[model samples]
Target: PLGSGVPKEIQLAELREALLGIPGVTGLHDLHVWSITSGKISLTSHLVYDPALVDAEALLGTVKALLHDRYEIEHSTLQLETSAC
Candidate 1:
């Protein structure tokens, strides 16, 4: 979750942009981001991907890296899906 100081919309917009930039990631939904406290952010989301075109583990790792590096999100729960929900 994103803490104070940053607006959720801004953070989410950036997140969506970064996520869609990845190959095989076609859609996203049920996305959640929040901070239990300042500097302790977590994120959860269902990610639509193309298994035929990308490695699932690699995709997950890439997302994890993006969240942690860009948004300071260290705790994340992500679901990979072939279709949007």
Candidate 2:
């Protein structure tokens, strides 16, 4: 969850950028968010990846690393699926 010190919109943008940075990630949606505190937010969402480019396991690993290291998303869950749309 992102601390409340940052604006929600800014936090969302940061999340978007981090998710999109993964190599086979083409799109994402159905994002759900919750505020754990006045300044912390938790996120969950379905992540779309190109199966042609990367396997599900690899994609999951990439996303997991980025979320933990770059975004500090300890409470988030990224559901991975194969899709190009």
Candidate 3:
């Protein structure tokens, strides 16, 4: 992933494996990792939602807090969008 900081395959494999480990994560609906700079990677995670059991904005906030607090991810560019079907 990124430019050359870490191999794309390695990063993706690692991220995929890591994210899939979370509870209530039935599955990853869509995911992508792209090169941003020589040592930076941009990531997007579109997760599936069941409307009856969750609130979209609440979930988004929780996810944002989780990423920021746990992963130390401080990017203003990263986004998390949740939708119910």
Candidate 4:
């Protein structure tokens, strides 16, 4: 009945695109996305990155900003990782 609203699969693609565009980010895993309510979404994922190329702590802030501005995801949990935890 169209009451369900937009498909979240589209959101996933856009998120993946935005995230992968960031420097030092090599891969993605353990990703999750869901709606808190209409127009509200939450995301959590492990971002494989090189700490040497990017500042992990600083990147965290930038990442949050990106998600908030580009995706409108107010709540996000990021796990920065390399080849291992």
Q: Which pairs, if any, clash in model 1?
A: 1-33, 1-34, 1-35, 1-42, 2-34
Supply the TM-score for candidate 3: 0.52
Error of 1 at 48 (Å): 0.2
Candidate 1 matches the true fold with a TM-score of 0.86
Candidate lDDT values, in order: 0.82, 0.74, 0.52, 0.79
Model 3, CA-based lDDT = 0.52
Per-residue lDDT, model 3, residue 28, is 60
Which candidate comes out best when scored by TM-score? 1
Summarize candidate 1's per-residue lDDT along 16-49 as a digit string, tens digits. 8788888989898887877677668777889999
Rank order by TM-score, top first? 1, 4, 2, 3
What residue runs in model 2 are displaced by over 4 Å at the alpha carbon? 5-7, 37-41
Rank by lDDT, highest first. Answer: 1, 4, 2, 3
State the weakest 10-residue window (summed lDDT) of model 3: 76-85
After superposition on all C-alphas, the RMSD of every candidate to the true structure, in Å, is 2.2, 2.8, 4.4, 3.7
Tens digit of per-residue lDDT, candidate 2, span 1-85: 3454654867777778778887888888887767676645567889888888889888878877776776555677778877633
lDDT of 1: 0.82
Candidate 2: C-alpha lDDT: 0.74
Worst 10 residues of 1 by lDDT: 1-10
